[PDB]
Q: What sequence folds into this?
DNA sequence: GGCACAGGTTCAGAGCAGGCGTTCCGTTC
DNA sequence: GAACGGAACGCCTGCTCTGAACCTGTGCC
């Protein structure tokens, strides 16, 4: 997760300032293919939720817990990337929504799994891999954007 | 009918202040 | 003029300040 975060940040900064050489021209299509594969991997390629029950006792439910956190982190980074790429093109935003829908699906799976045991699993609130910067820019673009050219995506 | 957060409570430790213990001078017969 | 009560500097007791955690009670799902 953190790795991908590092990658995203360095790479965006590269495109931003460095250019004004095959690794990054590859990585574009790398993350693209990863994103598309991520959209339509539905938790049974990961073997989650029904094959396992996130048992903090069992080695396997422990593993599930950990894998799931990693997954959600991954998704978050990809959300940042998909947003960053476009000049507000709609297919990527649909992708972001679907990513988030799987993410939230995982979070509420854990709420089902964290509803039963006592509330000392405060590891669910594991900090997001979104920069302060991106979040500022996101709310800026949600609430104070009336620009029709972008607005079809923001709606 | 159960879980989570709050709030109370309690204990452990540590730190510090004051009163009594020793020693002397004032006051009242 | 003397004696017994008021008076000052140091150490120990205990009490308080504070934090941290447990646990239990209530309200909402």
A:
């Amino acid at each position: 997760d953190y790795l991908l975060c590092c990658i995203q940040h360095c790479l965006a900064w590269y495109k931003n300032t460095v250019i004004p050489e095959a690794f990054y021209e590859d990585l574009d299509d790398i993350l693209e293919s990863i994103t598309n594969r991520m959209i339509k991997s539905e938790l049974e390629d990961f073997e989650l939720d029904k094959s396992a029950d996130f048992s903090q006792s069992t080695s396997i439910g422990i593993k599930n817990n950990i894998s799931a956190f990693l997954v959600m982190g991954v998704c978050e980074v990809l959300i940042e990337y998909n947003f960053s790429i476009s000049s507000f093109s709609k297919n990527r935003f649909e992708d972001i929504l679907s990513l988030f829908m799987c993410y939230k699906k995982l979070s509420d799976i854990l709420n089902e799994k964290a509803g039963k045991a006592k509330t000392k699993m405060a590891n669910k609130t594991s900090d997001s891999l979104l920069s302060m910067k991106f979040v500022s820019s996101l709310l800026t673009a949600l609430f104070r954007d009336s620009i029709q050219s972008h607005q079809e995506s923001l709606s």
